[PDB]
């Protein structure tokens, strides 16, 4: 029994605040274009394109369901 690690527990608490912030089952936040196509399980690259005449041409971040940013939603990541 060598294994044995831990992760951020009780992540959900009063201190933390979140209003209308989630991923999966999101649609094109653009006006008129109601692309409700289920985005891949990786926000790495999600195009509202889909297929119909809705494709905007600019991928978004399914994580924050907002404009694709070259940074992070909440905070950056690390190997550690
Ligand atoms: Zn769109
Ligand atoms: Zn994001």
Taken in order 23, 43, 69, 67, the sign of the CA dihedral is negative
- DSSP-assigned letter for residue 61: E
Distance from the alpha carbon of residue 62 to the mean position of ligand 2, in angstroms: 7
Residues facing 60 on adjacent strands: 46, 67
Residue 48 contacts residue 37 (beta carbons within 8 Å): yes
| Experimental technique for the deposited model | NMR
Q: Tokens representing 57? A: 């041409």
Q: For residue 9, what is the enclosing H or E element?
A: none
Distance from the alpha carbon of residue 74 to the mean position of ligand 2, in angstroms: 8
Q: Tokens representing 62? A: 């399914």
Q: Tokens representing 47? A: 């195009």
Q: Is 35 helix (H, G, I), strand (E, B) or coil?
A: coil
């Amino acid at each position: 029994g060598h294994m044995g690690e831990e992760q951020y527990n009780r992540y959900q608490q009063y201190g933390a605040e979140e209003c209308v912030l989630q991923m999966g089952g999101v649609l094109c936040p653009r006006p008129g274009c109601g692309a409700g196509l289920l985005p891949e399980p990786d926000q790495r690259k999600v195009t509202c394109e889909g297929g119909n005449g809705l494709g905007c041409g600019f991928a978004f971040c399914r994580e924050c369901k907002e404009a694709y940013h070259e940074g992070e939603c909440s905070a950056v990541f690390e190997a550690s």
